[PDB]
Amino acid sequence: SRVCQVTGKRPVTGNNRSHALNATKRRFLPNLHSHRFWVESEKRFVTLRVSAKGMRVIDKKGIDTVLAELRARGEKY
C-alpha cells in the first residue's frame, strides 16, 4: 500500500475545484520512493518505502532512532 513507513503518510481523498467551481473527487498520493538506507548497527543496507518528507527526518534524526521507533510501532522493515 502507498503508505510511508516513517511518517505514516497515506493517500488522502479530496476535491479538485475547476474554474467553474465544479467538484470532482481526486486523491493526493504521497511522494513515496523505495530507498536503501545504510545502517552501521547491522552493517548492512535496509530497503524502505519512504516519502520525501520521510527521507528528510531520517537525514536529520539518527537512522538508528528511526529504526528503533519503527520497531516500537510494530512495523516490519
Binding site: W38, M55, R56, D59, K60, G62
Partner: protein
C-alpha cells in the same frame, strides 16, 4: 547541510569544517563510505577532542600503509599469455578479474575494485599503460604486455 568530514575530499576536503553539502550527496556517498558523520550540536563536541587530532594519525597510517604496500613490486610490470587470434582478434575480452588474480598470485597483494582500466579494457594485444588509484592523491603506473601464444 552541515556535516563534519573525516577523509580528504578533493574539492571541499578540510578535515572537519562546516561546509554546506547537498543532502543527497551526503546520504548516497559520504555516510555509507564513512567519509563523514552527521554532526548537529552533538558530534561537534566529540570531534573537537576525540577526533580533531586523534583520528588524524589513525587516518594517515592507512595512507602510509597503502603507499608502502603499493610499491611492493619493484619490477612494476605485468605479463600475461593469451591465445589471441591469428593476426589480431584476441580470443575474448578480459576485464580486471584475471589481472587482479595474476597480480595476487605473483606480485602485489591488491583487491579487486582497486584495479582501474583507463585505456579501454585491454583489447588489442601489445604494451599498454594502466593507472591504479590506491589513494585520493596517489597514482601508480604499471605496464601490461599481452603475449600471443
Amino acid at each position: 547541510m552541515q556535516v563534519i568530514l573525516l577523509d580528504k575530499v578533493a574539492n571541499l576536503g578540510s578535515l572537519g569544517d562546516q561546509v554546506n553539502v547537498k543532502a543527497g550527496y551526503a546520504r548516497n556517498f559520504l555516510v555509507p563510505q564513512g567519509k563523514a558523520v552527521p554532526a548537529t550540536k552533538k558530534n561537534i563536541e566529540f570531534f573537537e577532542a576525540r577526533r580533531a587530532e586523534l583520528e588524524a594519525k589513525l587516518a594517515e597510517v592507512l595512507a602510509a600503509a597503502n603507499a608502502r604496500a603499493e610499491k611492493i613490486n619493484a619490477l612494476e610490470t605485468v605479463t600475461i599469455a593469451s591465445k589471441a587470434g591469428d593476426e589480431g582478434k584476441l580470443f575474448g575480452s578480459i576485464g580486471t578479474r584475471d589481472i587482479a588474480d595474476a597480480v595476487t598470485a605473483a606480485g602485489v597483494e591488491v583487491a579487486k575494485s582497486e584495479v582501474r582500466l583507463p585505456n579501454g579494457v585491454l583489447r588489442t594485444t601489445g604494451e599498454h599503460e594502466v593507472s591504479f588509484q590506491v589513494h585520493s592523491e596517489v597514482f601508480a603506473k604499471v605496464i601490461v604486455n599481452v603475449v600471443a601464444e
